[model samples]
Target: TMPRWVPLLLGLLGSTTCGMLLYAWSVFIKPLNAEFGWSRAEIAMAFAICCLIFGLMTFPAGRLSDKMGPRKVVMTGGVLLAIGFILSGFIQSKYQLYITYGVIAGFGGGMIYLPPIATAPKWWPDRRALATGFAVVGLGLGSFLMGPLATYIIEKPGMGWRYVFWYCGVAMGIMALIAGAFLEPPPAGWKPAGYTPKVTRDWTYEEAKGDTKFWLLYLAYFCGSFAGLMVIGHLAGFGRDAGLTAMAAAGAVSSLAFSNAATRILSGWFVDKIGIRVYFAALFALQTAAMIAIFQLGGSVVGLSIVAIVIGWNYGAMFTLFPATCLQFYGPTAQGSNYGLLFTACGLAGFAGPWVGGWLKDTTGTYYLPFLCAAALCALGTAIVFMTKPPEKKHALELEVLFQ
Candidate 1:
């Protein structure tokens, strides 16, 4: 039997490195434009591709991890991710960028990001939400590290985006490979001492998605992520346009990413006590205000920094709450696939967020429209979260029907 902590630690490592693919992306946006004179909307497609592809890939990644254990799939992730990054350094065209960073890196990122979250629940069933939080904390920890570090390298006298990709590629690749080599699943019918869990039916991937509750929660995920991704994809440029220097702009990425990671683990503890309905809905409401507050500050040094952290926490809380919520509703047996299916909403959001933000910026010469509208999305998501309750349990006959 593997020590629970071993898999937990590995999960943390995988998410930390992969987080750079999403959280650190803002640092590269403007630089790409400065060099290529590409419109923000066009250059932003790379981010859209990475996020969309990452979201879309999670289903397969989760299924593979559940089916084969985390070792081989994750090790493969490390190699593909490194290749994507290294090849990206050589890209001179948008199509090449799409191939290297969007398709290749994005797919690799999904492989890295899903395992810890999918597998950690099996190890810590008693502390499911909290365990999920810790499993993903590395994502937050890594993003701040990547943002500031990537920015520094990009702005370095001789180094640029190319060098940044090469270094991160090597770093992410090594971490995933090591973690993949050592990780394994908990034994069948495992449970910690002194804890007795309720009997819950395991829905197949098909049944889980068949429930209406699934799509309601899916809508909530989509709406909640839309604004956050918009901010994350554009905050650096927003800072620069609002008169902050490049360092300050990138500082927003670091600050936001740090807050994003910090909130995950903390919320995990409290979510266990408060229940998802009240807690998640309230956070969504907070996000509603958070979106407006950031723009109201007009991107000032003191103002933007404060709002960035606050908004990031609101955004980051969703990662922990949703997967744990899925496990609670449908039971853990099908969670790897169920949660991955639910995550597709974010994939769509990922494509829409940056693409729309950039298009609006290009058309109107401002991010104000996109930022304000994002607040509206959080509010709408809050309503949907309130409406979401546990799905009805299916009986033996219904379960038997699934196979036929």
Candidate 2:
């Protein structure tokens, strides 16, 4: 057997790099607005545009990775991330900033992100959940680290939001080098244990799309991602609305990241034992509960902290679980493209969730309506998961290097 720690180390490193990006984003919002005078909804649109572009890139990006291998794609992603951030330093106008930060940087992160996550499933078999969790915890824990770190950087004597972007840009370059050099594909002719693949005469993409389960998964993923990202993009704001100090509010948000990091690892271990469906359903239900709990929180530190933990745990685990569900139904080979389609739903939801929440707050001047709306979406997502029936397995997904 290969050294188990190799996969674990790779998983942790990849997750941590991606996680840093996650934290750098939300924590920068307040500073961006204060520095540039943009409204929250406007910022939402920028982020929304980014998510849309990022989501659209997944199909091509995954396809490219399928053909060329992940190393090249990952290296490209690192370069894009560096360029995007460095360019942000030169922006003197809002429109210029939009193109530099919103589109370029956003797309770069998307490109970098998918290869790592997509490749993980192919590496460790029996430990897929643990590996996935280890990878995603980097995302959660990065938020914990970046939230405070970004806060420190932005609040420093003279440096502000611009410097934050530059800092992140330089860091992405270093991490990209590490990931590219070390993350090789699995050894040739190796097989996962207990594996048996099905052979069909050949099912086309159109044929797969016709299945009812596809739509179910699509809708479920859309709403599920919408709810989770909405909270993630807004968690700190929620604490601030409830009257906590800046650090305390950020601390509350950071606390969720900690919970998310811990829970993702735990969730991964649990999924293998009880199956992905049970674990996912439980997370969605808990997320739904957190949404409801927000209405009553009304700015209390303890109550907000509870919301953070619940929401953060689900948010961190949600991305990891969707692939598992997709693989369970569609098989591994189907994942790259099929998951591309599923991720689009999330991309759209990510656009909608925060934008809608911001709009509701703008009009109503209270967070009540937005919280209710997000809760409704989460509830719908839960129902969608239950309603999605399993499909008949027709193939086993073994990654084959096509050129040979």
Candidate 3:
């Protein structure tokens, strides 16, 4: 009885740690600027670097999760994440900040993230998106919690940002370890009663790669996610640009985070009803609309916060929709590796999004161009999915031939 939810909850813990590290990145910008006199454009380059490595590291970690399990990898990632943040407390140069926060935490965040999403669906085969939603919803929850928590710690009398990074790292270290200790895959062949199996064969990573649908999903995922990555990487930075106090700027991020948290569950529930094939297209269309509106509505504290919330609503769904879609399409047999390979597109987007967004901000001195570019990516993402068909399952002899 007690063990039933233990795995999912641990997944939550793991995802929550990731959320705090990744989404709350915007929270530190003002302080980083205050201390170093760095502009958001320059600082965004650092953020891009972090996003790049975070995406890159997820692949190897996913492979390991497929081969072994999440326990060792997640625990190991937690240590590096913690060490990265702790080191940043004493960060001296821009280069040091990049390595400490970007690379070290990249290894930690990237490695620690994917398995829980993969693990949760295995436990609740009948409720794929819903299951994974609860697991990754912490990405939003952690971000929601971190934005406000960071402002307090950063503004805490006499302490500033060092305490924020130090405490943030220490706090997540424990949460991650506890998650690592408890998280696990369900027993082999475990299935909930009354559910009929849909997949004819569980495709291996190599096998899945041979299918055209995989690339479609991969390309679609990158396009759908790129705009959100760009906006999220600079949410508070934009808020500050619009003249919100740091706390108010953090609020802009929190609005998105809270909405981001809710939408994962909401989208998950909808995915089951609407079917992912349909919802995937709709989700990106919605993101495209939100990105277009963000520029018009992002001028005031109240307006920017609302638009951010709208942006979060659609953006957060990708975490639920894509992974669950992968599980459904590829089968959970090699989901860890399948999703890992698929995640490289996201890593590339991670690099491209912040770099492009930063470059636009530096050159244009406003968020309009970048937001429009994000909208374009979302539109392209929607178009790509329309061309994709559900992957056809192979027959037994074909499987044998392929394996041979």
Candidate 4:
């Protein structure tokens, strides 16, 4: 039998491949524009569509994963993701980009996404946050590894953007299939040795929807995501605008990627000790500062890199903290669906962020206004965290009566 840690390793691998495609999308932007003569806003809208579909589909994916097991769900997603990217290599129209990369790849990415994060807690109940972080660290590190690699490939004479997609898509598909094959959910009612299960009732998606606390968390997640997604989707361009050479801009993207990976592990380690509310408040505060600073510091390579690291660290915290937050609030039984619902906040942010950045740049000729707007959004999120309180535990009697 495989060791307990094997699933985590598989999850990390799967997530890394998923990250490679999504995070590296920005590297293709310039080439796509040069070839197609599309505006940044037009290109960004495709990313927006991808993000929107990715976010919206998570609920069904999570729900299905919980019911049918993650292996099948992730496997199907892997196949679709491969198809999306492979077909994207042949696109001739902007609408084709939306269909291939946006809908197809977006849906495929969503399928690959939730299973591992949701599965981590079930497998490692004792180290839920840490394990979850380890599972997703690939997402951050994938961009770090793939960003420059993609840039190099795209820059290579005669290599072209299509080749980059074909090569990477094949690799991502193979890795995701291998990882999905090895993933297994823990047996029902499983708990870590010597770990006493908490007595709080697990809320179903239906019940949770009625709670004010859920809505508050949703709003906060949206704000944090809006800011993070904006920067990530456009970080490379932001670097170029900041006066960095092309390769240096790619370096800036990788810098943010490294910082993002680091924060996930570090934040997960501390979330258990500090509690989600305290951790969230502090994280939002840091994000607020970083977003505001980018407006001032985004023009120079050094300044942009510094800001990228800061933003990435804070942004990375969201992936770790929010899933753990869902588990803590909702319980393990429904964690997949709960977190999926909450993650729509990120999807919403994903739709708004890159699109807004592209529009602002196109209209006003600067990313300054968007940066300020994101900072204000972070500030509002900070206030939300401070106001949020964990749901009060439902008494044992209440649980029995409700169930009956």
Candidate 5:
């Protein structure tokens, strides 16, 4: 058997790459707006496209990971990330930003993200929550690391926003290289320690798609993602308009990432011990409260950071929770594929949230309406979680598959 520490290391490296992608985007927003004089709606539309592509592409990537192993898929994603970011720095027009930054980077992100997530089932069935939490905490850590760093880089004399892409691209390239070296498919005939998955007739990926539970979970997941992504894409912009300095704003944003790191691990431990249903309700409530509180922060740095921290806690736990939740309902046979479908929902939310926020800002000259609407989205998600069915049995299906 590989050393126990192997998965933990792999998880951190892979997740940190994903986290940096998410964190770097917002860091560049202000500079892009100031330089180009693009409407917030226009800039946000680029992000929207990124989200759309990100969500839709994950299903195929999931299948690819299942067939080729996550190692290859993530490596390819890393290369694409390098290419996209470098190419993005050379762009002279907004159209280039859409293609290079929005589509290429988004596609690369989806490729790496889905596999590492699905890889959780391969490595640690008994401690799935902790394993998933640790990996996603890398994502949170990446955001925390990238946010403040990017802000600092952007402010350097004559370096400008273009360098943000160059720096981030190089950083991601190194992270991907480290990940590729360490990550491998599960050992041949591997199984989680001390666990025997429920036996069932072997089935193709197509057959797993036919389950009703998969679709319901997908729909439920869509609701959760829409609210969360909206908050991530807009929260920094909200802080800036409310008068926080760039450093303070980015730090506030990164604090969410930091708190997110903690919350994800804690929440994963919660679900692992308390059961997924109860875990879901708690996170949803936490997210709802955070979303609502955004409307009340009135230019106070402390108040905004507190809101970001709460929201970050909600956001951080989100990535850790989704795949496990999918496994809970659909069985391991469908975990990777189902999560790909579920993550697409997040992509959709990512696409929709910023546009809605920008539109609200354009119309009213303030973020009041957008913040309130996001809270409603949170409410809708909470309602979905409440209405969705819970596990009827203590244990769910365990797929029979060889890791390597």
Candidate 6:
């Protein structure tokens, strides 16, 4: 049998490359503004669309990966992303940017992201949560590494933002393509020795949604994610607003990215030991405080750095917790599709959070209101966490009877 770590390593590699497009996306904002004179709101809209499309695409892509395996689906996504990025470099109009980077690249990224999160857990039944965390840690690191690189590339002589797209596209595509060769599902009927099934019967998307717990989890995920996505989308800008230089602002993003990546892996380990309920509740409360702190102390470099680390830690915990929660309640048989559905909460947040922040900045000339709103959302998420429970045994039995 192939070592389980093989797929895990490949997942990390592929996801890390995809992170540049999502987490490091803000690096291009100033350049785009300088080049095309687009308003922040307009640029935010394109990102929102990209996030919306990225979330929307995951459902179908997840389904496809579940049915056919991850290899082809990821490879196809890699190629599309390469094409989208290459094309984005040549765009002259904002509309073209929407079509290439927003739609095409967004869709492609969804394809790359879903399979690894879904696939890695299957390979390491013994360490599902930790494996999932490890699988996606690369995503956090990608932004951490790419933010400074992109900033440097943008400022370097004889180089421009277009080259960032071109070079990243080529590198991302090549890495993803290589990773695909090693990505595969666990052999059929494989399970860790001595492992006992927690909850049997995989729940379909249709049946899963019928449960109240699903909606509660969805709300919790949405609210928590909304707060974090806002910070990531605007970290550098926040640094600038806090009176930092361009490089320093980029450093803030990198700091957040590093913290974010670290938290995912750590939270994943904690989830396996402490359980999701306590872990998630604690995470929500922590993030709520972090958001409030950012609002109260976001005006100085030291304050922003502290806020970045705290928020990044709390925000990064969501990716580890949410999917593990979904699998805990829904089971693993249809995880790709079910998790895809659950992930829409993230997509919605991605769309709403950044736009709301951008709008607030435009309207009030400050981010105070937006930060206040984010804290309120995090508070709401904490409330919802108590309501989030695994599907009752009675309900799971009913689902099995109907579906089987």
- RMSD of each candidate relative to the true structure: 4.0, 4.4, 3.8, 3.3, 4.6, 3.6
For candidate 2, write residues 1-404 as lDDT tens digits. Answer: 55544645665665566567644555656866886787765655666666776676666666666667767776777787678766877777667666776677667666666666656666766666666566556766666566777788788989877787788678776786577556645665675556643344223345556778888888888887887766565667777876788788777665776777788788878886778886688778888888888868737777778888888788767777876677667655545566666677866876677777767877888777777777887888788776676687654244222324
lDDT per model vs. reference: 0.81, 0.69, 0.80, 0.80, 0.71, 0.80
Each prediction's total of clashing residue pairs, residues at least 3 apart in sequence or on different chains, is 0, 2, 0, 1, 0, 0
Q: Is candidate 1 or candidate 6 better by lDDT?
A: 1
Better of 4 and 5 by lDDT: 4
Screening candidate 5 with a backbone cut-off below 3 angstroms (N, C-alpha, C), the clashing residue pairs are none
Residue pairs with backbone overlap in model 6: none
Rate residue 283 of model 2 by lDDT.
79
lDDT (0-100) at residue 65 of candidate 3? 90
Query: Using Cα atoms with residue i matched to residue i, what is each candidate's TM-score against the true structure?
Result: 0.86, 0.84, 0.86, 0.88, 0.82, 0.88
> What value does the lDDT take at residue 366 in candidate 4?
73
Model 3's alpha-carbon lDDT is: 0.80
Worst 10 residues of 2 by lDDT: 395-404
lDDT score at residue 60, model 2, on the 0-100 scale:
64
lDDT of 4 by residue, 327-390 (tens): 8877767777888788888888888876776566678787777777788888998998878777
Q: Which residue pairs does candidate 2 place in steric collision?
A: 19-139, 242-299
lDDT of model 1, residue 290? 69
lDDT of 5 by residue, 1-404 (tens): 57655767776776787778766666767877888877665666666776688677778778787777778887887887777776788887788988887888778877766776777655777777777777667767786678777888788998867888898788887787677666654676766476554444333356546656556666666666766665565677788878888778777765665687898788888888877766676677777787777767735678788888888777667777777776666555555676776777777777776666666768888666766776776676666666676434323244444423
lDDT by residue (tens digit), candidate 3, 86-191: 8877897788888988899878988888778778777777678888888888887886678889989987798888898888889988888888877778766656
Clashing pairs in model 3?
Answer: none
lDDT of 4: 0.80
User: Residue 392: error of model 2 in Å?
Assistant: 0.6
